[PDB]
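Q: What does the assembled structure look like for these inputs?
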Amino acid sequence: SGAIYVGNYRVVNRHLATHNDWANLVWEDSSRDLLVSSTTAQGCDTIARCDCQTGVYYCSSRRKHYPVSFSKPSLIFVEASEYYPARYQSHLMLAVGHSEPGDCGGILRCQHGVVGIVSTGGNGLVGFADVRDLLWLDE
Ligand SMILES: CSc1ccccc1CC(=O)N1C[C@@H](C)C[C@H](C(N)=O)C1
Ligand SMILES: [Zn+2]
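A:
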């Protein structure tokens, strides 16, 4: 679990969005596993606008943060799950690090701000949905 709170927006994994997220929908994209909903309270986070490929993510299944080197956002095949059919997920960045399904939502940050959230993983892999291209989250 986990969310980014920026301005009057809440960014979550689309597959973990609540009834309230859908009732306050701003934008969603199944191909990116992202959903953004509106909030009444002002957020606590700021978004990176950069090309970093290193950062630190929060891993809930270890109650710890880990440093990572990750690929640039790209279109990557993701096998079928309970939430989606087998498909290509776009704007996904992969890295070597620990993750389990419940780790989705953990934030990845670089020195400039929030980069994205955990969205996929595998045997010693962790994948992050990028949010740096969503300029309207502040603008
Ligand atoms: C951190 S998720 C994870 C970690 C280790 C092993 C397996 C997973 C599960 C995983 O990759 N997916 C299943 C589900 C959570 C939806 C995800 C998606 N964005 O399509 C894909
Ligand atoms: Zn950066």
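The pocket of zinc ion (ligand 2) is lined by residues 48, 50, 52, 110-112 (CB under 6 Å).
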